[PDB]
Amino acid sequence: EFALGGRCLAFHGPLMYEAKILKIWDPSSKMYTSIPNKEIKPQKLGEDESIPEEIINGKCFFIHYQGWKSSWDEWVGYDRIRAYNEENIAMKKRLANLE
């Protein structure tokens, strides 16, 4: 359902937005896997990188919102991320259209 480089939906405020998964964090190992630019190996957080305290102890996803500047790329947990499927797309549309 949530793969490296895959599509997802993510809450940002009250609405949902299409996003792409760029990294996946394992809270047990304290390492993430990342899209390139094994073969893809887990790696520690960079010296200047941070994951919010609120979510660092769970599985986290570093996402890019489709069409937004890369400055909005951020870590989210399961509270905010959603599978890209028929039910969640319809919910995304309802939240924006109907409230």
UniProtKB/Swiss-Prot annotation:
It comes from Saccharomyces cerevisiae (strain ATCC 204508 / S288c) (Baker's yeast). Residues 38-47 have a biased composition (Basic and acidic residues). Component of the NuA4 histone acetyltransferase complex which is involved in transcriptional activation of selected genes principally by acetylation of nucleosomal histone H4 and H2A. The NuA4 complex is also involved in DNA repair. The chain holds residues 7 to 113 of 401 of the full protein. Component of the NuA4 histone acetyltransferase complex composed of at least ACT1, ARP4, YAF9, VID21, SWC4, EAF3, EAF5, EAF6, EAF7, EPL1, ESA1, TRA1 and YNG2. Present with 1890 molecules/cell in log phase SD medium. It is found in: Nucleus. Residues 7-82 form the Tudor-knot domain. Residues 33-49 are annotated as: Disordered. This is Chromatin modification-related protein EAF3. Belongs to the MRG family.
